[PDB]
Short mmCIF file of N, CA, C and O in Angstrom, two decimals:
data_model
loop_
_atom_site.label_atom_id
_atom_site.label_comp_id
_atom_site.label_asym_id
_atom_site.label_seq_id
_atom_site.Cartn_x
_atom_site.Cartn_y
_atom_site.Cartn_z
N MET A 3 43.28 277.07 187.60
CA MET A 3 42.35 276.75 188.71
C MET A 3 41.01 277.35 188.47
O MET A 3 40.23 276.88 187.65
N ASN A 4 40.65 278.42 189.20
CA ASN A 4 39.35 279.00 189.25
C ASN A 4 39.15 280.12 188.28
O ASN A 4 38.19 280.11 187.51
N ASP A 5 40.05 281.12 188.26
CA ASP A 5 40.02 282.28 187.44
C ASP A 5 39.95 281.98 185.98
O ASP A 5 39.22 282.60 185.21
N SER A 6 40.69 280.95 185.53
CA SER A 6 40.69 280.43 184.20
C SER A 6 39.43 279.74 183.81
O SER A 6 38.96 279.87 182.67
N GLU A 7 38.81 279.00 184.74
CA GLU A 7 37.57 278.31 184.56
C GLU A 7 36.46 279.29 184.40
O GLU A 7 35.74 279.29 183.40
N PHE A 8 36.34 280.23 185.36
CA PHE A 8 35.51 281.39 185.34
C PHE A 8 35.56 282.18 184.08
O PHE A 8 34.53 282.48 183.48
N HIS A 9 36.77 282.54 183.60
CA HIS A 9 36.97 283.26 182.39
C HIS A 9 36.53 282.54 181.15
O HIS A 9 35.91 283.16 180.28
N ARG A 10 36.79 281.23 181.01
CA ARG A 10 36.36 280.51 179.84
C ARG A 10 34.89 280.30 179.76
O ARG A 10 34.27 280.39 178.70
N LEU A 11 34.25 280.06 180.92
CA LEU A 11 32.83 280.07 181.10
C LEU A 11 32.24 281.39 180.76
O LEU A 11 31.33 281.48 179.94
N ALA A 12 32.77 282.49 181.33
CA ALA A 12 32.35 283.83 181.06
C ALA A 12 32.38 284.18 179.61
O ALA A 12 31.36 284.63 179.07
N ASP A 13 33.49 283.92 178.91
CA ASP A 13 33.62 284.06 177.49
C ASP A 13 32.56 283.38 176.69
O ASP A 13 31.95 284.01 175.84
N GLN A 14 32.26 282.09 176.95
CA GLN A 14 31.25 281.41 176.20
C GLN A 14 29.85 281.88 176.45
O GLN A 14 29.03 281.88 175.53
N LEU A 15 29.50 282.31 177.67
CA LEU A 15 28.23 282.88 177.99
C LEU A 15 28.03 284.19 177.30
O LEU A 15 27.13 284.35 176.49
N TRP A 16 28.95 285.13 177.59
CA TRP A 16 28.96 286.46 177.06
C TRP A 16 28.84 286.51 175.58
O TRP A 16 27.99 287.20 175.02
N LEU A 17 29.67 285.72 174.87
CA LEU A 17 29.61 285.58 173.45
C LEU A 17 28.33 285.03 172.95
O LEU A 17 27.63 285.68 172.17
N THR A 18 27.94 283.81 173.37
CA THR A 18 26.79 283.13 172.85
C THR A 18 25.49 283.81 173.14
O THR A 18 24.63 283.85 172.26
N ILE A 19 25.32 284.42 174.32
CA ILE A 19 24.17 285.20 174.68
C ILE A 19 24.05 286.42 173.83
O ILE A 19 23.02 286.61 173.19
N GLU A 20 25.09 287.27 173.76
CA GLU A 20 25.10 288.45 172.96
C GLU A 20 24.79 288.20 171.52
O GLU A 20 23.90 288.81 170.94
N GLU A 21 25.49 287.21 170.93
CA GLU A 21 25.29 286.71 169.61
C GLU A 21 23.89 286.27 169.33
O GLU A 21 23.30 286.68 168.34
N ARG A 22 23.29 285.45 170.21
CA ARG A 22 21.95 284.96 170.06
C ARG A 22 20.91 286.02 169.98
O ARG A 22 20.02 285.96 169.14
N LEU A 23 20.97 287.03 170.87
CA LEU A 23 19.99 288.07 170.92
C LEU A 23 20.21 289.19 169.95
O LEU A 23 19.24 289.80 169.51
N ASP A 24 21.45 289.48 169.52
CA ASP A 24 21.72 290.28 168.37
C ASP A 24 21.21 289.69 167.10
O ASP A 24 20.79 290.39 166.19
N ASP A 25 21.23 288.35 166.98
CA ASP A 25 20.75 287.60 165.86
C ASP A 25 19.27 287.60 165.70
O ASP A 25 18.76 287.93 164.63
N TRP A 26 18.51 287.19 166.73
CA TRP A 26 17.10 287.00 166.66
C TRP A 26 16.33 288.28 166.60
O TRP A 26 16.65 289.23 167.30
N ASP A 27 15.28 288.36 165.76
CA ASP A 27 14.46 289.53 165.68
C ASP A 27 13.40 289.55 166.73
O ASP A 27 13.63 289.18 167.88
N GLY A 28 12.18 290.01 166.43
CA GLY A 28 11.19 290.12 167.46
C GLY A 28 10.02 290.97 167.10
O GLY A 28 9.79 291.31 165.94
N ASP A 29 9.24 291.36 168.12
CA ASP A 29 8.21 292.34 168.04
C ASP A 29 8.82 293.68 168.27
O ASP A 29 8.70 294.60 167.46
N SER A 30 9.55 293.78 169.39
CA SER A 30 10.26 294.94 169.83
C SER A 30 11.58 295.00 169.14
O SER A 30 11.90 294.19 168.28
N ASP A 31 12.42 296.00 169.48
CA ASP A 31 13.76 296.11 168.98
C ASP A 31 14.69 295.59 170.01
O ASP A 31 14.28 295.16 171.09
N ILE A 32 16.00 295.58 169.71
CA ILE A 32 17.02 295.00 170.54
C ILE A 32 18.28 295.75 170.27
O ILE A 32 18.70 295.95 169.13
N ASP A 33 18.90 296.25 171.35
CA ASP A 33 20.26 296.70 171.37
C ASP A 33 20.95 296.11 172.55
O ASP A 33 20.58 296.31 173.70
N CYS A 34 22.01 295.31 172.31
CA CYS A 34 22.85 294.75 173.31
C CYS A 34 23.95 295.69 173.68
O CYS A 34 24.63 296.26 172.82
N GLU A 35 24.16 295.91 174.99
CA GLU A 35 25.23 296.69 175.52
C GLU A 35 26.30 295.78 176.00
O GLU A 35 26.03 294.76 176.63
N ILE A 36 27.57 296.12 175.71
CA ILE A 36 28.75 295.40 176.10
C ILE A 36 29.64 296.38 176.78
O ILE A 36 30.13 297.35 176.23
N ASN A 37 29.84 296.14 178.09
CA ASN A 37 30.71 296.91 178.93
C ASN A 37 31.66 295.96 179.58
O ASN A 37 31.62 294.76 179.33
N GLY A 38 32.58 296.46 180.43
CA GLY A 38 33.69 295.70 180.93
C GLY A 38 33.36 294.65 181.92
O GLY A 38 33.39 294.87 183.13
N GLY A 39 33.03 293.44 181.43
CA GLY A 39 32.53 292.34 182.18
C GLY A 39 31.06 292.44 182.42
O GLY A 39 30.55 291.87 183.39
N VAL A 40 30.32 293.17 181.57
CA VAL A 40 28.94 293.46 181.76
C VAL A 40 28.23 293.34 180.46
O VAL A 40 28.69 293.86 179.44
N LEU A 41 27.05 292.68 180.42
CA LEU A 41 26.14 292.73 179.33
C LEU A 41 24.85 293.31 179.80
O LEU A 41 24.40 293.11 180.93
N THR A 42 24.21 294.14 178.95
CA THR A 42 22.95 294.72 179.28
C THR A 42 22.07 294.67 178.08
O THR A 42 22.31 295.29 177.05
N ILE A 43 21.02 293.84 178.15
CA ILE A 43 20.23 293.42 177.03
C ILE A 43 19.03 294.30 176.97
O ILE A 43 18.15 294.18 177.82
N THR A 44 18.97 295.26 176.03
CA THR A 44 18.06 296.36 176.12
C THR A 44 17.08 296.40 174.99
O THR A 44 17.46 296.32 173.82
N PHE A 45 15.78 296.55 175.29
CA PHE A 45 14.73 296.59 174.32
C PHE A 45 14.31 298.00 174.04
O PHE A 45 14.72 298.94 174.71
N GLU A 46 13.42 298.22 173.06
CA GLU A 46 12.95 299.52 172.68
C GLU A 46 12.03 300.13 173.68
O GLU A 46 11.85 301.34 173.78
N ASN A 47 11.47 299.27 174.55
CA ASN A 47 10.71 299.61 175.71
C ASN A 47 11.51 300.27 176.78
O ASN A 47 10.96 300.94 177.65
N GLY A 48 12.85 300.17 176.76
CA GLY A 48 13.71 300.78 177.73
C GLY A 48 14.04 299.88 178.87
O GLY A 48 14.95 300.15 179.65
N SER A 49 13.30 298.77 179.03
CA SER A 49 13.58 297.75 179.99
C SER A 49 14.69 296.87 179.51
O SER A 49 15.11 296.95 178.36
N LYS A 50 15.24 296.02 180.40
CA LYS A 50 16.52 295.42 180.15
C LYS A 50 16.86 294.34 181.11
O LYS A 50 16.35 294.29 182.23
N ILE A 51 17.77 293.44 180.70
CA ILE A 51 18.36 292.42 181.52
C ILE A 51 19.72 292.89 181.89
O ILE A 51 20.45 293.42 181.05
N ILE A 52 20.13 292.70 183.16
CA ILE A 52 21.38 293.13 183.69
C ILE A 52 22.22 291.94 183.99
O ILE A 52 21.88 291.13 184.85
N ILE A 53 23.38 291.78 183.32
CA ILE A 53 24.29 290.70 183.51
C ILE A 53 25.66 291.21 183.80
O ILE A 53 26.24 292.02 183.07
N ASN A 54 26.22 290.76 184.94
CA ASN A 54 27.45 291.21 185.51
C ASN A 54 27.80 290.12 186.46
O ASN A 54 27.06 289.15 186.64
N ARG A 55 29.00 290.18 187.05
CA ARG A 55 29.65 289.04 187.62
C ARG A 55 30.32 289.35 188.91
O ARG A 55 30.73 290.48 189.19
N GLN A 56 30.40 288.33 189.78
CA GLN A 56 30.76 288.46 191.16
C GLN A 56 32.14 287.92 191.37
O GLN A 56 33.13 288.53 190.96
N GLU A 57 32.26 286.76 192.03
CA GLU A 57 33.52 286.21 192.44
C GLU A 57 34.24 285.54 191.34
O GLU A 57 33.62 284.75 190.64
N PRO A 58 35.52 285.70 191.13
CA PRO A 58 36.30 284.82 190.31
C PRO A 58 36.56 283.51 190.98
O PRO A 58 37.71 283.14 191.24
N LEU A 59 35.47 282.77 191.26
CA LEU A 59 35.43 281.39 191.61
C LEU A 59 34.59 280.80 190.52
O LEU A 59 34.99 280.67 189.37
N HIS A 60 33.32 280.52 190.86
CA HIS A 60 32.24 280.36 189.94
C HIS A 60 31.10 281.17 190.47
O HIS A 60 30.34 280.65 191.29
N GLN A 61 30.91 282.44 190.09
CA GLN A 61 29.74 283.16 190.48
C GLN A 61 29.43 284.34 189.62
O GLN A 61 30.22 285.27 189.46
N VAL A 62 28.23 284.34 189.03
CA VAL A 62 27.71 285.34 188.14
C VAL A 62 26.32 285.69 188.55
O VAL A 62 25.65 284.93 189.25
N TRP A 63 25.81 286.88 188.18
CA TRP A 63 24.56 287.45 188.56
C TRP A 63 23.65 287.50 187.38
O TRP A 63 24.14 287.52 186.25
N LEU A 64 22.32 287.54 187.54
CA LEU A 64 21.50 288.18 186.56
C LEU A 64 20.24 288.76 187.10
O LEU A 64 19.50 288.15 187.88
N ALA A 65 19.95 290.01 186.70
CA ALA A 65 18.80 290.76 187.10
C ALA A 65 17.91 291.18 185.98
O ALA A 65 18.34 291.39 184.84
N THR A 66 16.60 291.25 186.25
CA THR A 66 15.54 291.48 185.32
C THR A 66 14.35 292.10 185.95
O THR A 66 14.46 292.85 186.92
N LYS A 67 13.13 291.83 185.44
CA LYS A 67 11.85 292.36 185.78
C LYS A 67 11.41 292.06 187.18
O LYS A 67 11.08 292.97 187.94
N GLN A 68 11.41 290.78 187.57
CA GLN A 68 10.96 290.33 188.85
C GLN A 68 12.01 290.49 189.89
O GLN A 68 11.85 290.12 191.05
N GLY A 69 13.17 291.05 189.50
CA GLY A 69 14.32 291.24 190.33
C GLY A 69 15.43 290.43 189.75
O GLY A 69 16.35 290.97 189.13
N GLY A 70 15.34 289.10 189.89
CA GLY A 70 16.35 288.18 189.46
C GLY A 70 17.13 287.61 190.60
O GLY A 70 16.82 287.82 191.77
N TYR A 71 18.18 286.84 190.27
CA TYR A 71 18.95 286.11 191.23
C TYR A 71 20.25 285.76 190.58
O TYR A 71 20.45 285.94 189.38
N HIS A 72 21.22 285.24 191.35
CA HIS A 72 22.45 284.78 190.79
C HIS A 72 22.38 283.42 190.18
O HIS A 72 21.46 282.62 190.38
N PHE A 73 23.38 283.19 189.31
CA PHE A 73 23.42 282.23 188.26
C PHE A 73 24.45 281.22 188.63
O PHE A 73 25.64 281.54 188.71
N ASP A 74 24.05 279.96 188.89
CA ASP A 74 24.95 278.96 189.38
C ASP A 74 24.77 277.69 188.63
O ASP A 74 23.73 277.43 188.02
N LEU A 75 25.80 276.83 188.57
CA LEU A 75 25.86 275.72 187.67
C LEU A 75 25.44 274.45 188.33
O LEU A 75 25.85 274.12 189.44
N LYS A 76 24.57 273.67 187.65
CA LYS A 76 24.15 272.38 188.09
C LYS A 76 24.89 271.33 187.31
O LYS A 76 25.58 270.49 187.88
N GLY A 77 24.79 271.37 185.97
CA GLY A 77 25.52 270.47 185.13
C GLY A 77 25.70 271.03 183.76
O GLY A 77 26.57 271.86 183.52
N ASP A 78 24.83 270.64 182.81
CA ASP A 78 24.88 271.10 181.46
C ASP A 78 24.06 272.33 181.27
O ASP A 78 23.71 272.71 180.16
N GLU A 79 23.71 273.01 182.38
CA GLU A 79 22.64 273.97 182.41
C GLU A 79 22.89 274.67 183.70
O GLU A 79 23.20 274.05 184.72
N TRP A 80 22.85 276.01 183.66
CA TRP A 80 22.97 276.83 184.82
C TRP A 80 21.59 276.99 185.37
O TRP A 80 20.60 277.00 184.63
N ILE A 81 21.43 277.05 186.70
CA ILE A 81 20.19 277.31 187.35
C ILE A 81 20.23 278.74 187.79
O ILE A 81 21.28 279.39 187.77
N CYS A 82 19.09 279.31 188.20
CA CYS A 82 19.12 280.43 189.09
C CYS A 82 19.09 279.88 190.48
O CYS A 82 18.29 278.99 190.74
N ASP A 83 19.91 280.37 191.43
CA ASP A 83 20.04 279.84 192.75
C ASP A 83 18.79 279.84 193.55
O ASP A 83 18.49 278.88 194.26
N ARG A 84 17.98 280.91 193.43
CA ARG A 84 16.70 281.21 193.99
C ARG A 84 15.97 280.12 194.70
O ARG A 84 16.06 280.01 195.92
N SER A 85 15.22 279.25 194.00
CA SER A 85 14.86 277.96 194.48
C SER A 85 15.57 276.91 193.69
O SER A 85 15.59 275.74 194.06
N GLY A 86 16.17 277.28 192.54
CA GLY A 86 16.76 276.36 191.62
C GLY A 86 16.00 276.44 190.34
O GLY A 86 15.18 275.57 190.04
N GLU A 87 16.24 277.50 189.55
CA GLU A 87 15.50 277.73 188.35
C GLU A 87 16.33 277.30 187.18
O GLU A 87 16.96 276.25 187.23
N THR A 88 16.39 278.08 186.09
CA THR A 88 17.02 277.61 184.89
C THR A 88 17.52 278.75 184.08
O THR A 88 16.76 279.70 183.85
N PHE A 89 18.76 278.70 183.57
CA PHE A 89 19.36 279.56 182.60
C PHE A 89 18.47 280.03 181.50
O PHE A 89 17.81 281.06 181.62
N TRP A 90 18.44 279.29 180.37
CA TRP A 90 17.87 279.69 179.13
C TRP A 90 16.40 279.92 179.20
O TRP A 90 15.84 280.78 178.52
N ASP A 91 15.72 279.13 180.06
CA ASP A 91 14.30 279.12 180.23
C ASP A 91 13.80 280.27 181.03
O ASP A 91 12.81 280.91 180.69
N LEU A 92 14.47 280.63 182.15
CA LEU A 92 14.03 281.73 182.94
C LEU A 92 14.36 283.03 182.30
O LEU A 92 13.58 283.98 182.28
N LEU A 93 15.55 283.09 181.68
CA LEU A 93 16.01 284.12 180.80
C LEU A 93 15.09 284.36 179.65
O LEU A 93 14.83 285.52 179.30
N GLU A 94 14.49 283.31 179.07
CA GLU A 94 13.38 283.40 178.17
C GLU A 94 12.22 284.11 178.77
O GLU A 94 11.85 285.17 178.27
N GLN A 95 11.64 283.64 179.89
CA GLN A 95 10.56 284.29 180.56
C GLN A 95 10.76 285.73 180.89
O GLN A 95 9.86 286.55 180.73
N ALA A 96 11.96 286.10 181.37
CA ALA A 96 12.41 287.44 181.60
C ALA A 96 12.40 288.30 180.39
O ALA A 96 11.72 289.32 180.32
N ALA A 97 13.13 287.90 179.33
CA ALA A 97 13.22 288.62 178.10
C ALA A 97 11.91 288.73 177.39
O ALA A 97 11.50 289.83 177.02
N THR A 98 11.18 287.62 177.22
CA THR A 98 9.83 287.52 176.74
C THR A 98 8.87 288.46 177.38
O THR A 98 8.10 289.13 176.70
N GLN A 99 8.85 288.56 178.72
CA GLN A 99 7.94 289.43 179.40
C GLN A 99 8.26 290.88 179.28
O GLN A 99 7.36 291.71 179.25
N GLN A 100 9.55 291.26 179.17
CA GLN A 100 9.91 292.63 178.94
C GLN A 100 9.80 293.05 177.51
O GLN A 100 9.37 294.16 177.22
N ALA A 101 10.15 292.18 176.55
CA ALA A 101 10.11 292.46 175.15
C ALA A 101 8.75 292.35 174.53
O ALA A 101 8.37 293.19 173.72
N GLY A 102 7.96 291.32 174.87
CA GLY A 102 6.62 291.16 174.42
C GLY A 102 6.40 290.10 173.40
O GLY A 102 5.36 290.08 172.73
N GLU A 103 7.35 289.15 173.25
CA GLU A 103 7.29 288.06 172.33
C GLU A 103 8.30 287.09 172.83
O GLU A 103 9.25 287.52 173.48
N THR A 104 8.16 285.77 172.57
CA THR A 104 9.11 284.76 172.91
C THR A 104 10.49 285.01 172.42
O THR A 104 10.78 284.92 171.23
N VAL A 105 11.42 285.34 173.34
CA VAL A 105 12.80 285.55 173.04
C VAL A 105 13.51 284.25 173.17
O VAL A 105 13.65 283.65 174.23
N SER A 106 13.95 283.72 172.01
CA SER A 106 14.32 282.35 171.86
C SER A 106 15.77 282.09 172.05
O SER A 106 16.58 282.27 171.14
N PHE A 107 16.17 281.64 173.25
CA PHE A 107 17.53 281.29 173.56
C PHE A 107 17.84 279.87 173.25
O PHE A 107 18.95 279.55 172.83
N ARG A 108 16.87 278.95 173.40
CA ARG A 108 17.00 277.59 173.00
C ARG A 108 16.53 277.49 171.56
O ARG A 108 15.32 277.72 171.29
#
């Protein structure tokens, strides 16, 4: 049902995100933190993206510079619930603004 859906989604996000940002270089440095259901994407500046998760239905969080918002699914692309933003793109703007160079998720 839900827990399984949540978990498989979680697995693919967690993996692909961590992998992507461990892979890509930059201006700044990058150390990804992996904790128990938590990712924390940390630059040499000391600033960071906070990723952690809420309900085992479909609900995940993400926090950054401007604060952030929770992460909800539209279709092939997660939005931020806020007004209805975007996964990879807003995450780009977040990471980019804290790191100091285009952090390329797409």
